[PDB]
Amino acid sequence: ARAX
């Protein structure tokens, strides 16, 4: 999500 935010990281990927």
Side-chain angles (χ1 to χ4, degrees):
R2 74 290 302 293

